[PDB]
Each structure stands twice: as C-alpha cells, then as structure tokens.
Amino acid sequence: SHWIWQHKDWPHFFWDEKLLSSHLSSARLVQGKLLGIIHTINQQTARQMNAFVLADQAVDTSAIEGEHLNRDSVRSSIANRLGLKQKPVDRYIEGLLDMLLDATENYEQPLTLERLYGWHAALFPTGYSGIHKITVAALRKTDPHYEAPPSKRVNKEMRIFLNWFNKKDLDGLLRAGIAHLWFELLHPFDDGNGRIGRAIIDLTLAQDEKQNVRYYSLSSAIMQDRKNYYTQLGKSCRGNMDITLWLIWFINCFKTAIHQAFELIDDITLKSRFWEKHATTELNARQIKVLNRLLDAGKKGFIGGMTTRKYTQLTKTSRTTAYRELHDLVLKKCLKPLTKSAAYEIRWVNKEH
Amino acid sequence: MSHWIWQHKDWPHFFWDEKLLSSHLSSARLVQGKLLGIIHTINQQTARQMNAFVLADQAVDTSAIEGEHLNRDSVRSSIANRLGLKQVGINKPVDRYIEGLLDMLLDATENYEQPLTLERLYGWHAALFPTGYSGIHKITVAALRKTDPPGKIKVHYEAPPSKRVNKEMRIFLNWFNKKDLDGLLRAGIAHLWFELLHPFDDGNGRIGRAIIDLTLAQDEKQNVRYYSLSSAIMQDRKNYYTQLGKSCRGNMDITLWLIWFINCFKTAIHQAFELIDDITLKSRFWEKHATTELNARQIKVLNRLLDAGKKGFIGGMTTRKYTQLTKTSRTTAYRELHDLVLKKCLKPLTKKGRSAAYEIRWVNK
C-alpha cells in the first residue's frame, strides 16, 4: 500500500476542480497570447523561432537525463531539416529529432504501442543504455528511489493508459499533465521513459493547439525547475489518486515555458527591428561584430553592459579605438550609457521604425 | 414568480456553479489571449485603425440597443478628429450626445486604474443627457433616481424603490472596487447587478455596458477596447433581455447568466478576429501595390472596396458602381477597371462575362 499504483482506486486520478479552474484559465490566457503572436509574425520570423525552440527541446530533454549534446550538431541538423542556410550524421541526434518531430507534426494520429516502440528505437540504436543491454522497442520484462509496477502488469496498464489518452475527453492542458505523470509512474520501458514521456506532452499540446510546430518547450521549463520536478514526482508516486498538487506544478511549468517563449520572440523581433532601423547607419566591421554580440544577449543584455575592455576583448583593437568607436555608436544612437568605468547597452528600436 | 430578485432573503449574494463555469472561463481566456497577442504584434498604425472601428461599433451599437439610431458617418467623423486620423467628411456642428457618449466610453476604458464612484457615474450620466431631457421627458440628470425606474425592448421589471437605491449602489460599488475575483466573472456580475438596480431615470443600459468596458480594461490593463460586447449583444438582443431574466430570475443562482455572458464575450472576440483580419488584408494589399501605378480615381475606388473587407460588395464592383463613386463616363470606367485587373488589383468575381463584376485580388502572407 506504499505506492500509488497499489492504491485500490488506481488509475482513477482526480483533482480539486474548483482550485484548478483559476490555474487553467490563467494558463490559457498566456497560451493564447503566444499563439496570437505566432499567428501575426511573418513566416521567416516563425521559422527562426521554430529553429531556436527545437534546439532547446533536444538539448534540454537530453540534459534532464544527464546527456549533453553537441549543440553545433543539433543546430546543423535542424537547419537541414527546416531548409535554413549552413559533417557526419549523428544517429542519436537524428533519432531524437525524428521522435520530437513525429510527436508534434503527426498530431492527428493516435498514440499506439507501435508508435512508442518507434520512438524508443529512435532513442536507442545500439540496444544499450550506457554499459547495460536493454530491451529496445518493446515493453520491459523485468523491474526498471521508486518501485514501478511489476512487469507482468505493464502491458495491461499501457493498454488502459492509451485507451484513455486517445479519447481526448478532458481539457487539453490537464490531459498533458495527467498523461505525463501516468506514463512516468508506469516506467514502461527499460530506459528512455523520461524523454518519451516529454514527447507525449508535446503530442498532447500539438493536439490541443492543432499546431504542427512547438513554439515553446516544457523540457526547457522542466530543466529549469528540475529540483521541484523530481520532488513533485517523488511525492506523487507515494500519494493517493488526488493529483491536484502535481497538476498545479505542471501548469506552472507550462506557464514558465510560455513566458520563456515570450522572451525569445521578443528578443528575435527586437534584433530585427534594430537592424531594419540601422542598416542605413554607417558602421565598420568591428562595430557590427560588437553590436551583433550584444544584440544576441537580448533585452537582458550583458551583466556589466558593454565596456571598452570588453570591446577590445572581442575585437582585439586598441583601447583608444574602442573608446572612440563606442562613443561613435552612442552618437549614432546604437548604444546608450548605463549608470555607475563607462558602460553601454543597446538602445532598442521600439514600436515602428 | 412571487418576489423580485432584489427581495430575496439572500440578496445581493449571487452564486454560481464554479465547476460548470471553469471550462467556459478557460475557453474565453484562450481566445482573449489570442486577440491580445495579435494586438501586441501588429504595428501602431494598424492597432489605431482597429481602435477607431471598434469605437464606432461601440458607440453605434450601445445606442441602438436602446432604440437610439446614430448616423455612423457622424460617429466616424468625431472619432477621426479625436484619434488624429484623416478627416471623415466635412466638419459639421457637433452632436453633443455623440461627443458625450464618446467621452464616457473613452473614460471607461482609458482611466481603468481609477475606482468606480457615484461621482464618476454622475459624470457619465451628464454626458449622455446634455439637455436634461430623455426625449420629451425631463429627467433627473447626474443624480440617482428619486422616483420608480422607440426600438427599446420593454421588459415589465420592477427595480428597488428609490428610497433604497443609494444604499444599494454603495454596496454594489464597495464590492466592485475590491477587484477580488476573476475579471470576466466580475464584468458579468457587475453588469447584471447594475441592471437589476436601474439606478438612474434613464441611461442605465449604456452606463451598465460602460461598466463592462471599465471592468475588462482593468482585467487586461489595456486602455483601448479592441472588441465590443455591445456589438455582440446587438446580434442577440432578444436573448440578452431574456438571459438577464429580469422578470422571474428569482434565485441568486446566476450560473446561466454568466455562461450566456461569457458566450457574448467570445462572440465579441470572434468578431474582432474577423475585423483585424480585414484590416491587415488591406494594409498588406497596399504594401504590395505601393509601387503599382494608379491614379487618384483608381485609389479612391480600391479604398472603398477594401474597406468592405473579405466579404466585399454585394454583387461585387460593377461599371455602374465605379461611375457612382467617381463621376466618370462609362468608357473611362471600362478602361480603369480593365487597368486594375491588368495590374492584379481586381479579379473577375464571376466566370461569365454577360454580367461582369469584380472583387479585390487579395494578397496573402
């Protein structure tokens, strides 16, 4: 009677509907805002956004498990996939990307055992997880601090989970949060349950939005909040069927993901508006190099601002030239001074210019 | 059927089914956010065009709910002067009612950080009744009624006696200024509660819908209305009064009213989606045709057709319509319409040339 899946009412999850109401409506409000932004920006800006988020998705869902991808390989593969400008094929990165893209692009298709087996084969080409040989593309046949249900139960538990999942008879955000917790508690594979469960979240949200591109990443939010994530899973797996606290945690993670996406799209459009306004500005290569470095840090900027010393670390020019070129950038309204050595920050081009 | 709702022993403690309303609120927030995200992302000029159009709908429709039928051109002319837009028609003497009505609507959405007070309501009421009369009847203006409560819909409802109105309003305003509940619920409750009190001799509907505007502006922190619940209420006028249920509402359970109110909000948002889509189609058209050579007549006609949006003119643009808008001969119209097809501005709205008509060749993303 220690684990949730031993509970007499398993797997009939329930929650405090009156309490969740204001969390869900506030989540829908920011989700709608992001969707309204994406609908209005042009296709070039959306494709750049898509490229950034997909690289974060791959990197962060891997980092959650302690696996650190070559980001250059990730970016290069995404650029080829999306048709953007710009090595050996990295089988693990391609398989991870193929799983993530199947989950958001084929959202009209049901989640089936065969489809999960394909995701699992995409993550484990060699049949090994580190040193350990595992079962690939099939449910575990043995035991995976948490004890998951015994393996003789796993095939039925998964049939119930999937019959429930494909009904879509609940608010889409709740289905995402329930599906993630339920899948994790079953741990149906020998390994890869974390990445596949987060791909299930992606599938659920793509079905909810009817949107075949993820413009935000829950993995990036989970990774940012990883300590609470593990604490909350640990509490839930020892709890009863009232998963109110898990769902509040999950909706807050969703909101964090949307807010990170607001910041990204705001940074992308701030930069392009800046360069529309200043392509008429005469600048030499060094000034253009330094402005791009600072613009890519976005609204948050450099901690101390741009300084003469940082300018000479990036350009390798003399202090006198950096000092004068920085004043030149102030005069041309590209930079503006900060407040107690001199420091500068981007002068943003806000609204129409 | 035995007692008015304001005689109920639990008045004014409205309640509703939180579980049933949850999915309506979540759905409403989603489309509200979508509109707000669009508004945040379009440029300033586009947002201002949207503002001017919604504000004319707000003025015309909140008046039409009461059987007061405004000249839309006058409203547009007054809005264009206030928002610094290109002049609409020759500047004629002002209609004090239109300017007061606009003053009220703009105060409700722009000064959203200020509380609602009796003094503020009196100012709105003075703006609506500048002559001191409601038609033939002299009425109490800029003060609560001292007696008992056209195309206006009559409802046989009895509001509280005037000796109680000031106390009832103080209770209502103390609740209103707490801002202690979900903004959409607050807008729905505020409007129902105000309507049931009928605090003024006349003007209660228009002031009650301005209170909705104030509430939504406070919810959104947005000093411009980009959608209009009056325009939605106008499409369902009869159900509006029915759903208010003034006669036979009876209990303090307002679940059905709040669900209706949330549906009207969503209708208003869905209408704004269509409007902003039409506005952006036009600006996108003029971006592509900024280099297209056109004379002033062709530009006048295209602007008139583009202002009809995707739906277009009934029957499309015709030769005769071209000559009614330009005062040109038929042969000049044949050449200029042909020229506009050649330059990809217009396209044949029919496949048959016996009768010929044209529509805008839209420029998609």
Author numbering:
A (entry chain B): 4 to 89, 94 to 151, 165 to 360, 364 to 376
B (entry chain A): 3 to 151, 159 to 374
Q: Which sentences from the paper describe this structure?
A:
Here, we identify the protein product of CBU_0822, in the following referred to as Coxiella burnetii Fic enzyme 2 (CbFic2), as a DNA-binding protein and AMP-transferase that AMPylates Histone H3 at S10 and S28. We show that CbFic2 acts as a bifunctional enzyme, both capable of AMPylation as well as deAMPylation, and is regulated by the binding of DNA via a C-terminal helix-turn-helix domain. According to sequence analysis using SMART including outlier homologs and PFAM domains, it encompasses a conserved Fic domain (115–223 aa, Fic motif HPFDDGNGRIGR 205–216 aa) with N-terminal inhibitory helix (TSAIEG, 62–67 aa), an N-terminal domain of unknown function (DUF4172 domain, 4–85 aa) and a C-terminal helix-turn-helix (HTH) domain (304–362 aa) of the DeoR family. We propose that CbFic2 performs AMPylation in its monomeric state, switching to a deAMPylating dimer upon DNA binding.
